[model samples]
Target: SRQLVLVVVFVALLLDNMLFTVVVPIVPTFLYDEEITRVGVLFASKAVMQLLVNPFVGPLTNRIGYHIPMFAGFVIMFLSTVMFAFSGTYTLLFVARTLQGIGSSFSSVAGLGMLASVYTDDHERGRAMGTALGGLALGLLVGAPFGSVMYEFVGKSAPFLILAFLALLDGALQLCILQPSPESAKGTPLFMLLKDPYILVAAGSICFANMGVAILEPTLPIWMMQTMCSPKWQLGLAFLPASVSYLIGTNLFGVLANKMGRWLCSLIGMLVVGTSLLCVPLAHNIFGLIGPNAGLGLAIGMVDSSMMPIMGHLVDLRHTSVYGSVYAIADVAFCMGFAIGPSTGGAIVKAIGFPWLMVITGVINIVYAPLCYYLRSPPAKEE
Candidate 1:
């Protein structure tokens, strides 16, 4: 039952992410046709909304229960996708993306909280978190190619409709089958969450991870378009190595975290991811891109697999609200980076070139490694 639940949540997360990163590979062309000035705004606005709502989401989940927030998130995503399907203007797309972001924020944070509630033992927590983390990476890995295919065959609206359907399916599963946490209705969520410092570290790690990916998402496709002489399908192939490597890395690291501890794994993973980012721009061909993607895959795997487990450690059994809040905080960072990355990358590309932009973004990823060291782990001597 637990495994089945995780699978559903994982698929839901994939759907949410598909709405965000999947569009990047196609966004340059999309905006070019529309005469939009800032593609970054579309990406960032969603993250910005996550940031604004994260602080409240956790508390709200505590007060109302995860089921409602989780269901509502899917509903919001469904509507957002519908809006995007019909959107003809850049402004409409931007609004649609923002709403999707808001829904995604709720899904991610609340989902984690619910997981925390279900697993009380060390083994269960470790495996559950690991599987879900792998799912997140898989979502990104698959969403790219899937989105591209939809765009090619059915047109851009097809991807939007597909995402909407996925969300609806996920909502139905949660509503019908998933069991509620032990404390479905509890104390003030905000009051409980604000007291903890560990949430901040989790949020920071999430921000840094998003920042690293944001650099790749908006910029990498354009880089491929300009530099690679291959056919259109080759672009999707180029992403394959990194995405697969990331999935492998996360699965391996998920197991490793069981022994090394979640906080230690996260710190190491951040460093690994950052170092890989530095290598991305130096690639003169597909090989250059492939190496960094593999490295990044490992890095992100470490962070994703361990982050929630560590966050789970921080809160007492009764205070699941912290999970929701922390999830939101982390996603907010993701959305902000998404918003910032494209505009920044595009500006840099316009001014200098893709090569220089890659270097700058890679450097940013590398520099964030030390930030992970400051993150607090779950309380010791509790097990």
Candidate 2:
């Protein structure tokens, strides 16, 4: 049962991100024609909706159960993908993206919440989350490069159509395979969970780390396009190194978190991520970008592996019902960072430049390390 649940959740996360990123390579050239800021808005729209819907979705998962929400998410994604494939106007595209965000919120919160319910041991939970995130890494590994190749060889709609079919298959698997967990239905109120200092600190750390990542979503591809004069496949390939490294880092950090403590592991991970982002501007070619990209991937995997398990630990510390809400807040933090990163980065890039934006993001990440360290300290004794 444990193995089955892990496999199901892993595949769910994999499909979610695969559908999300498959369009990255094609969007700049085919959809928007180098209007980078508008592209940022497109990305932002999805994240913003995810942010808004997450709190509700979290609670909903606690009340209902994971299976229904998972199925709903897959259905919504299928519809959104079809719309994205056929979208002719800006308004239509925006609507499709917004729906996609809603689907993502449902799937992610429910899926991770289910994982937390099944994995009771802290160390094992860390490993499970990391292994599950492997699906995310693999999705990016396949989606970006494959999507670009499909676009190059086939029509514009082919990638979306393929993803839509995958979503259907994933939904069917959920219905057939995922067993319902009535035990997880009991949770505490969101207000009570909010009062915990530990939860706040963890969520904040997740937000800042994701913000650093999101800053690149809009600018990196454009930079690659300009620097390499690359085609779609090359644009897709730019993300390959990071995805590969992230896969390695995810499994590695899962074990490290068990041995080293989550706080220390996360701090070191963020520092590495910060340094890597700072160096992104120095990359003059596709080959040059690979090293920095790989570094970022490693850092992200470490951070993510620790973060999700931390959330699971928090839920285990309290009533199981709070799992949905707790994971939801984490997702909200993640979505908000993504929302702010690209939208804000786009404006910053237009005003100052890409290199400066990287510097600013890098500094934010580095500074965040101390905050994590501070949160790890035990509360001061009353005099």
Candidate 3:
């Protein structure tokens, strides 16, 4: 049963991100003539909505159920994908992407919450989060390549249509395959979630990590368009190094967390990510950035693998609400970072250059490392 659940979650995540990023390479080309600033805004819309709606998702999930949120998320994502395929104007595309973010938040939070509820022990929970996050990393790695091929063969709209179909199919499968867990029906007050210091630190770490991640996703395509002077496929390949590193980073850190402790692992991981971001500005070509990107992937994997379980651990057995709440906050930060990353980088590129943005963000991230110092673990209970 555990294996089945894991498979279902992994497949669902794969489909979700594939739908999200399939259009990324071509989005700049399709609308507004690949203008760097416009492309940045387009991607930012997805993050904006994600940031806006995430704070409220926990209460919504509490009122409804995880499955319901999951189901709704799938539907919204399908619609958004279809809309993007047909969209000519940037406004339409922006709205579509916004809906996609909303859907992604619902599905991601509920799905993760379900997973956290199922795993009772700390190590098992770490493995589960690592496995599930690894699935997401794979989706991101594959999605761009898949979209690039479709764009080459069938034009830009083809990938969006394909994503829409995938979303629908996944939704249907989820309906049939996933059985609801009891925690979905339980409720925890928003105040209690806010009062937890560990949860706050976890949220802060996620916010910073996401901000760093945002620097990568939207700008990589533009960098390729300008530097590689190649097709979408070439740009898609850039994600390969990062993707493989992401998988390795997550699994490795999961093991490390078991030994070094979650707080230490998290702090070290964030420091790595911050340093990588700073180094990004130094690289003149994709080759130059490979090492930095690998560092980034490893850092992201470590933080992701550790942070989710830490949040789950913060709340007591009955306090399953933290699962959704923590996710909601993290997603918000992630989405915001995604949206802001491209535009911010583009602005820097326009005013000064790409490397400057990386340097600045990297320095900021490095400074944030000490914040993790305060992330104390809960005291052990007496038998």
Candidate 4:
């Protein structure tokens, strides 16, 4: 059953990010040149609906068990994936993306919440989350290329339809493996969790970790082209170093965190992330970027692996095992970080250039280290 739970969440998160990113390479091909800006709306529409629905989804999950939302999410995403593949007009695509957002919101919160509740032991939870999140990183790495390549060979709908079949597999696993459990009373309120220093730190770490990666999306390609005189494939593969190392980082820190300390791993990883960012602008060529980019990826894995379980730990400490609301807040931070980074990152890079922007962001992350000092204790190892 535990193994099945792991596989189910692993597959769900994989499909979650794959579907999210699959459109990037296909959108231009699908839409007319005049509708270029509509792409932004189609993408943002997903996050907007995700952010809006998460608050409700979390509290509601606490009332119900986790399985329903997790299962329902597969169905929703499967529907949206088909819709996105079939629709030619922006309006239908917009609606499909919006629905995808809602589906992701439900599934991720439920999936993570379920993971937290099931892996009751702290060290085991840490390792489990680390492995599960690799699915997320893998999906992001593969999705765009999968769309573009499969479209050329087969059709636009081909990639999505393939994912749609996988979604059914995800749903079937949830249906068979996770028999429903009794719900606890609703978990802590979001505002209340927001007020706690520990929860805020946890949520902020998640946001910054995501934000650091996201900042690259809008600004990095142009920099690679203009400054390095790099080719298009280099831009596409820029983060490949990060992706590979992130897998290493998450699993590495996940195992070691029990010994070294959870929040400490997080703080040190931030310092590493900061250093990596500071190094990014210094590299004149894409090849020079491999080390720094790998550092950021590894460090993000460390931070995310630890931070995720830390939310569950906080819930165990202050609230019951009904983890919906706490993980919900983390979900909000994820969407916000991704959304905020790209939106403001382009403007900031335009004003000051990539070096200063990276410098300031890196410095901010490095500076955030001390805030972890005020938190009371290393709660994990005591047992």
User: What do the candidate models score in CA lDDT, each in turn?
Assistant: 0.71, 0.79, 0.75, 0.81
Estimate the TM-score for candidate 3.
0.87
Name the candidate, 1 or 4, with the larger lDDT value.
4
**For all candidates, what are the clash counts?**
4, 3, 2, 0
Cα displacement (Å) at residue 177, model 1 = 1.0
Q: Which ranges of candidate 4 are over 4 A from the true structure?
A: 33-38, 179-182, 376-383
- The best candidate by lDDT is 4
Q: What TM value does model 4 have?
A: 0.93
Error of 2 at 338 (Å): 1.3
TM per prediction: 0.82, 0.89, 0.87, 0.93
lDDT of 2 by residue, 1-383 (tens): 77888878887788778877777766657665356667668867888888899878877776677788987888888889899888767778789888888988988888888888777787778887888788878886787767878889997899888888887787777777874324434678888888877788888878877776678866787777776677765765677787899899998888788888888888988898899999988977778888988899899888888888887676555445357888888898878888887777756877899889889878988977876775454443244
> Whose TM-score is greatest here?
4
User: For residues 153-238, could you state the per-residue lDDT of candidate 1 as single tens digits?
Assistant: 88988887888787777777776776433355454445455466666667667767767766676667677778765567666677
What is candidate 3's lDDT per residue for 76-182, written digit by digit as tens?
Answer: 87887888788888677778888888877877887787787677787877887788888898888788878978988988788888777777777667767774333
Give, for candidate 4, the lowest lDDT window spanning 10 residues: 33-42
Runs in model 1 deviating more than 4 A are 1-4, 21-36, 155-159, 179-198, 221-236, 317-322, 348-383
Give the local distance difference test score of model 4.
Answer: 0.81
1-383, model 4: which lDDT tens digit per residue? 77678888888899988998889878866676324234555666777678889988987886668887887788889999989878988667788888889899988999888888788998888887887888888887888888889888998889988988888777776777785435746566777777777889888888887778778666788788888998776777887788889878887887888889887888888999998988898887878989998999999898888788888887787655678888899899889866666556656877899899888878889988667664446353234
